[PDB]
Symmetry: D2
């Protein structure tokens, strides 16, 4: 039989876009095609407001938009636990929390774009122990992105190449390079982003005067 | 004051995708930014079933999906006149028909991707008289696409470069290369296309067993 | 052992670019990786000057630029035969000519980008009999291009589908969408195209005042 | 008259690629088109071997490959100073060094891709004071990359926004996303990278058995 899998995606979702959503769909089809897994749930976990330095919309707004974006999904949901904590938390700690909730068994895997995968190399950006825990205790499903070579990132990492069984590279045959930065700039200029992010999210943004 | 403009997009829309929809939004923002125009309406006109040679879904299905895709649009509508004619018709003839309907005044412009623009060069593909009529009697709004250089296509065409005032090049700052061919293949393989085309269109496709 | 193969690329090569050259390298590695072919030669065949609408540099110059571009290749050569003929010739006839030239015969295959494969669908562009002879008697090696879905083009064409074993889809994780159209426009504006086309080609264009 | 400018590109150049070289040409044409600058020299400065996690070819080889790649450039040279230092140095210190070297002084500007500009946002990556000194005392010329929105990065950073007059955004309608990571993987698999990196660089890699 197949192994139950839960996909967890961390990030800003400022705001959530059709690309963030597509990422789950591609990752699920990929895992199913292997024959070894059955994805049972997707979780969008927006980052906390204390995180880094940037014009991030308040967390309850990002959580609300993600919930709206996901109303037509029968398997992906937003979980505000991370954004509701007092302070920002390293990714691995969010994975532990959700793993615990699962035990109250499905394998919990981190879901991300190939660009996040490239950051594992940035000096003083990720503790090696954390990278090891992600691919050894949990798993990693990476969706391709233009200009990134996930296969090489894995091969050149002493930690990643040792845990390839738990790293899944999902190929994105559709060029969809929507960046939320662009979405925010467009909105600020009063330009349309319809068909780039969910209609309901656009409505929420307008109703609450976000990204003006 | 501004000149009223109606945008007309011909094509297969087999099925309509989020990219076809985005094309209208980008074209409208572009024309408005010039200050010279006010886009008052968008029209999706699906090609007739006698057209060329291919696995085209029945026209009433393509019209229905486009209508569903456009339910959340307050300015773009589908017009089945073209698909309802007895036989396929050259683009310019569809422009004449819609121009007539407008008179029962707004400028009617053809809307298309930069790839369509490149076909103007293909031997025995477009009558020069028709290309001239399009950019001289009507107008052309072209949305950019990866690998195409609209500015060069215009400059190298003796007909197009003489009517640049009526040709509008709208830039697409977002890499969104979704092809309907891929959508159909994915659907046939039972893969997800959610977030690539409208939810309602996906439902219609499933309900009517299209692209199996 | 392996079936010997010769690759033939037809096109404008106005001017030849690094992408046109990359196309050969990608196709050769793909055929070799199948384990059953050995590519022994590549042929660049610039189109005749009587062809099409677009105004191209003289074939004398396009052949010269290809020769210069190919000085550092040990397996690809330019063949002027096609451009030296009194008038434009259909692709199938150029294949027949080069096949005769090879007369334990190697297989001669047409090398092209996925955009060319999509034109097989265009009404009144290719004679069905030519499409059949090309994929059945010669073979097609298609290199991927953004926005094109070769697999779908093949599945939706009864002729390509029936002979799909003779169509080899090659691709690399590199987004290299440089159009010669852009190249000419840039040259016309006095901008650099260094590192987009070979240094030797740029020298010839400057020395002979082309693309002004 | 025009302000003389020197462009400095820092990075791994592991190995230097046609895209790294194209970056200089695009930046120079952009600065010249503003009508107020005259680019007099370009400097490629390979990073020190003590830098980061990823295992890079020896700096001796990366400097050699850049020198060979640059033999056909009449304005860009490689400068080994940075890689010859006992240990890795922050970008701002390399700029200061080269600025001193130039000591009616030309303006020295950092040349990079938009992805680098996005890293300014990363928590604990750059010292705010360094970001300020880079954009205020030197200048930044950023070349566009797919998926990045430089204009938005600048608008959302108070430091970049305040000094945006010293940040020059250059870009060309060419999708050239070749990653050196892909290059190394391909070389490791015995595949061709001809026409993606200079011929002279490929010869050196083969002669010295690099990237095995
Ligand atoms: N267009 C795209 N294609 C594939 N993955 C994408 C994507 N856009 C975002 N992602 C992925 O979605 C996850 C969350 O992204 P975010 O944290 O919201 C940064 P972003 O989406 O790039 O917006 P930004 O421009 O504000 O940084 C990441 O794993 C990222 O890789
Ligand atoms: N991803 C995209 N980006 C920009 N324009 C697009 C686009 N996809 C389609 N278009 C435009 O939408 C209009 C209609 O396209 P269609 O006639 O449906 C062919 P298509 O969308 O490429 O599907 P196909 O693969 O079945 O041919 C054309 O003007 C085309 O240029
Ligand atoms: N960037 C690219 N990637 C892959 N194949 C490409 C390519 N650019 C061109 N080709 C292929 O190279 C062959 C010859 O192309 P040409 O006939 O010269 C037209 P082109 O190269 O698109 O320039 P154009 O802008 O003048 O039309 C074709 O098979 C085409 O598909
Ligand atoms: N395809 C491309 N287009 C524009 N800029 C590019 C580029 N590829 C790399 N660059 C730029 O070239 C400079 C040096 O890059 P490097 O430090 O060598 C990392 P890289 O080139 O991405 O290879 P990598 O895959 O090993 O990381 C950077 O400013 C980077 O932004």
């Amino acid at each position: 039989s197949r192994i139950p899998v839960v996909l967890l995606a961390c990030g800003s979702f400022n705001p959530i876009t059709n690309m963030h959503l597509r990422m789950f769909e591609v990752a699920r089809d990929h895992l199913h095609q292997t024959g070894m897994y059955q994805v049972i749930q997707g979780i969008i976990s927006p980052v906390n407001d204390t995180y880094g330095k940037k014009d991030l919309a308040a967390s309850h707004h990002r959580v609300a938009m993600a919930r709206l974006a996901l109303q037509t999904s029968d398997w992906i949901r937003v979980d505000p636990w991370e954004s509701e904590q007092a302070q920002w938390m390293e990714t691995v700690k969010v994975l532990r929390h959700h793993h615990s909730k699962l035990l109250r068994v499905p394998e919990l895997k981190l879901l991300c774009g190939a660009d996040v995968l490239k950051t594992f190399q940035t000096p003083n950006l990720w503790k090696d122990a954390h990278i090891q825990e992600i691919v050894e205790k949990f798993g990693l499903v990476c969706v391709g992105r233009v200009s990134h070579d996930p296969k090489g990132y894995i091969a050149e990492s002493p930690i990643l190449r040792m845990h390839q069984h738990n790293i899944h590279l999902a190929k994105e045959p559709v060029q969809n390079e929507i960046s939320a930065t662009y979405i925010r700039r467009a909105l600020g200029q009063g330009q349309s982003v319809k068909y780039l992010i969910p209609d309901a999210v656009i409505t929420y943004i307008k109703d609450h005067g976000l990204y003006t």
